[model samples]
Target chain A: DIRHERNVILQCVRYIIKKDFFGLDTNSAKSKDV
Target chain B: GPHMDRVSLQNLKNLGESATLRSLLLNPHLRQLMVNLDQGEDKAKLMRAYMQEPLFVEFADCCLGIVEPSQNEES
Candidate 1:
């Protein structure tokens, strides 16, 4: 189960970088405070 | 059995030196995420929240992309 989770985490990272990085707007919209 | 692989020590060594990563590490929450992963917590869930943050995604991509290419060339 943990093994699966690690692999899933890695795959999710790839998806974010490959797709989201391109599709998502990169702007100053993000705030400094969280 | 499935072929199992995970990020190794060498991978971190390669990614750790980047200026982008150095800057990202300044974030306390990012460091906390690293600690959670290291401690073998439920990473898939922990990562879910952080992934939505563009900074975290950028940090993660820098991490995965840097080491990902090296392994293929060495083979």
Candidate 2:
């Protein structure tokens, strides 16, 4: 129900940055602190 | 899981410094809507509404054009 335009656009940004910084896979202490 | 230790640490360091930007943000409502952002449909709707707020819209519009130009958008 939440794929509404601006939100989809906004959230895509959220996902990219977080994944960029955090990486989609991890095992370091950084992930937890993230 | 590939670990680029030094670069990974650099990302973390940059993230920490990025918090300095929170003070630059004048819109509390935007921050509230974004917290975990896994909030849900209602919060998502609210986020869109808040984007219509003045400064957010200005910056958001700036952002809309700031993505990598050659990056393909599937939409």
Candidate 3:
């Protein structure tokens, strides 16, 4: 069972950042608790 | 069609497990996504469908929104 969804999201974020999407919102990557 | 290189993949997983981002797995949609990869139709479409849920990104954002704890809380 190769689970790849989360990876897509992470890589999506990193790539989004790497590409500097929309000029990189600094607060975009912050985490939250449930 | 994003692909993670082995190093990037492992590094992300390494950082995630050591912190609260690993908690993303706790979301039932995410957890189930891990377990249920249907073999029937086009897998790419299936993969895309799983992520179509609006809550997926919000929750992923929630995971990323976790803050680092203070030194006082560290063991």
Best model per DockQ = 2
Candidate 2 residue pairs in clash (backbone atoms < 3 Å):
none
What are the per-residue Cα lDDT tens digits for candidate 1 across B36-65? 543446755765776677766667766765
Query: Which candidate wins on lDDT?
Result: 1
- What TM-score against the true fold does each predicted structure earn? 0.52, 0.37, 0.37
Predicted complexes: DockQ each: 0.05, 0.09, 0.04
Colliding residue pairs in candidate 1: none
Cα lDDT for residue B4, candidate 2: 19
- Higher TM-score: candidate 2 or 3? 3
Return the candidate ranking by TM-score, descending: 1, 3, 2
Q: What is the number of backbone collisions in each predicted candidate, taken in the order shown?
A: 0, 0, 7
lDDT of each: 0.54, 0.41, 0.43
Error of 1 at A29 (Å): 46
Q: C-alpha displacement of B31 in model 2, angstroms?
A: 2.2
lDDT of model 2 at residue B18?
Answer: 51
**Which docking class does model 1 fall in?**
incorrect
lDDT by residue (B14-70, candidate 2, tens digit) is 332454333323455544444434344565466667566765454344333333132
Residue range A1-24, candidate 2, lDDT tens digits: 223335433443354345543434
* lDDT agreement of model 1 with the native: 0.54
